[PDB]
Amino acid sequence: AAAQVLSSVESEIGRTTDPVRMYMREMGTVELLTREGEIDIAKRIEDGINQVQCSVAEYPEAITYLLEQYDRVEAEEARLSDLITGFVDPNAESIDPELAREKFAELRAQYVVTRDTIKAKGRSHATAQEEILKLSEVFKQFRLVPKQFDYLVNSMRVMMDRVRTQERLIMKLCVEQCKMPKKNFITLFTGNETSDTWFNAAIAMNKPWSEKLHDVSEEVHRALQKLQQIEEETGLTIEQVKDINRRMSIGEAKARRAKKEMVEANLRLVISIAKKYTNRGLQFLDLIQEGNIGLMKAVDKFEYRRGYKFSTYATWWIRQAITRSIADQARTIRIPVHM
Amino acid sequence: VPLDGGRFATSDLNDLYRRVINRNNRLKRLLDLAAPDIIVRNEKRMLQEAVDALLDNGRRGRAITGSNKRPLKSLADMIKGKQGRFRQNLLGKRVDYSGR
Amino acid sequence: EEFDAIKIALASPDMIRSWSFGEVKKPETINYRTFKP
Amino acid sequence: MGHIELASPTAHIWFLKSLPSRIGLLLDMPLRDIERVLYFESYVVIEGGMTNLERQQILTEEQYLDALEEFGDEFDAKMGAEAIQALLKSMDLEQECEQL
Amino acid sequence: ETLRVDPTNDRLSALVEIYRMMRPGEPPTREAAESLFENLFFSEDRYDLS
Numbered sequence: 001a002a003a004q005v006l007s008s009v010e011s012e013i014g015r016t017t018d019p020v021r022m023y024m025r026e027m028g029t030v031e032l033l034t035r036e037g038e039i040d041i042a043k044r045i046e047d048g049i050n051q052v053q054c055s056v057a058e059y060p061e062a063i064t065y066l067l068e069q070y071d072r073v074e075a076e077e078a079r080l081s082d083l084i085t086g087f088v089d090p091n092a093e094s095i096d097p098e099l100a101r102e103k104f105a106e107l108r109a110q111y112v113v114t115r116d117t118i119k120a121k122g123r124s125h126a127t128a129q130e131e132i133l134k135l136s137e138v139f140k141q142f143r144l145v146p147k148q149f150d151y152l153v154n155s156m157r158v159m160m161d162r163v164r165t166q167e168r169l170i171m172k173l174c175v176e177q178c179k180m181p182k183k184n185f186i187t188l189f190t191g192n193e194t195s196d197t198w199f200n201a202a203i204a205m206n207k208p209w210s211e212k213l214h215d216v217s218e219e220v221h222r223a224l225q226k227l228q229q230i231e232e233e234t235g236l237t238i239e240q241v242k243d244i245n246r247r248m249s250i251g252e253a254k255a256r257r258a259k260k261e262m263v264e265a266n267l268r269l270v271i272s273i274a275k276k277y278t279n280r281g282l283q284f285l286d287l288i289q290e291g292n293i294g295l296m297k298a299v300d301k302f303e304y305r306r307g308y309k310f311s312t313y314a315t316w317w318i319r320q321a322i323t324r325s326i327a328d329q330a331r332t333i334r335i336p337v338h339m
Numbered sequence: 340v341p342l343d344g345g346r347f348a349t350s351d352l353n354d355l356y357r358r359v360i361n362r363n364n365r366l367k368r369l370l371d372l373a374a375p376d377i378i379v380r381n382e383k384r385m386l387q388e389a390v391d392a393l394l395d396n397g398r399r400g401r402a403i404t405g406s407n408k409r410p411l412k413s414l415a416d417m418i419k420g421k422q423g424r425f426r427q428n429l430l431g432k433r434v435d436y437s438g439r
Numbered sequence: 440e441e442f443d444a445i446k447i448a449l450a451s452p453d454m455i456r457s458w459s460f461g462e463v464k465k466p467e468t469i470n471y472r473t474f475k476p
Numbered sequence: 477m478g479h480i481e482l483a484s485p486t487a488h489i490w491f492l493k494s495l496p497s498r499i500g501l502l503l504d505m506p507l508r509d510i511e512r513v514l515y516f517e518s519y520v521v522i523e524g525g526m527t528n529l530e531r532q533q534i535l536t537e538e539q540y541l542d543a544l545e546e547f548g549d550e551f552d553a554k555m556g557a558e559a560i561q562a563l564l565k566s567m568d569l570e571q572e573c574e575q576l
Numbered sequence: 577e578t579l580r581v582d583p584t585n586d587r588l589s590a591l592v593e594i595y596r597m598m599r600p601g602e603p604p605t606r607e608a609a610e611s612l613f614e615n616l617f618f619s620e621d622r623y624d625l626s
Contacts (some may be wrong), residue, residue: 004538005603006603009601015511016601019381019384022515023381025601259375263377264377267377285385286361286365288381289365289381289382289385329361329467332468333347334471335471356466357466357468360465360466360480363481363483366484367483370483380555383556384515386484386486387486387557391489456479459477459478459479460478461478462479462481463478
């Protein structure tokens, strides 16, 4: 919406290779935001983080991996290390083991009363669905420090990459060998999800393009054995995992576009605070880049309930970034920060 | 090399090959995380300017200033200009046993 | 060594890595309290 | 000797603005467009499956937004040396020499 | 003949071209170009005349 002015600017430019004028002509598109205009951006960040956390809470084995890590940190009889500080520290709407027992006894009780009622009358029974929702509402009360929380997000990312890698391998081998259309594939992949009855239906349908199938079946119903192993280890359907991953993608994308709108409207605060810290220690474009990194690190840990403006909170982080950049090398030799 | 007065004698090539590897590591840090595209393109053309300055600095209209308030001498200036690595040490150079 | 002719060409990247005996990660050069690099 | 693990590829300065832009002599494109694409000013069409544009066609910030929301799934375009190295990888010599 | 060649009419058509001649690579403004003109031609602290 601002390229018509930039075209008339670049028609005058005789191929300027200096990145300073280039940087402050690409950053001048987005104007200044208002004071109360970023409150809605922060609320969209809240909605995205809450959607990602609901997608984590709907995953049933997250409590299982959390109890496994808790047993591994509880195993050798005496620990007060830094790994225990990475756990919950619950916020309201100095960690002692007595409160840990008092708040984990009912969690273990809800876990052992939820696990035993899985096979009762169905996989997705309504009473079992209410028990899963109650366990999720219990799990949403205790929220982690983001170190172990991002560790569990990365573990869920690795599990999602394994599942989608197996599914992508099956799909690419099918497209490479039999060249199956998506209309006869997506419907069966949504409907059946358990056995090879869709494979038998594809055999029962004549379809003379599908005659190149018998020499690849020894891999076709071998790659589905890995999916059977995943369903034996997890006990979940494919469509629910895809819906959780889609909601997690939406909850990450909302915060991502919010960070885009934040940085494209606050590059100029970075350059205004960075052009006064150019006392000939190093060339200032690295200071601009480190100020942008400090802006990112200040946006990543910004609060809303404080009621203050973002510039006062971000000033300390961007001065810390400029300080560690000007104290990183500062010479041809290496000198520490305390020196 | 350390001097007789304890001073250090380093080259500007050390500064060029230091800043290039520094911004290469900074590009690795920016590409290992979710960075905005303006920041990524900024780091990319800074890397482009630094590599093409390490190849030959100061034959276009603008060069790197701010080392010792002199315009910078690159590795290609040992060969191209009046300093002349060829003319100084290849078709004639300093030889032993002489006097005047 | 003996030499007869000189021929130049564009160097291949894997060839340059073949006569590259190592890789440098960070551009720090020497320590300040001792001269060991 | 030693090498540097360099992620984002960078062109060689003695080939672009040096006489007489051998890239423009080998690709049949003016050096002004080469300087505009390799300095992150505008996009360039590498290879398009549709019949809208052809090879060596630059697109600005407005033209890419005008042509992006209509078509898709067959349009490939990059900014910087990646598009140039992809164009030099995807080109052929024998058919071009026969056409010349 | 210079008036025949030059197509500019008023001060707004002149200061844009002068400020583009000063520093290329910037959208044209009035206040910054006017302040640059006042500090390069009508200033005393930043412009001494012996």
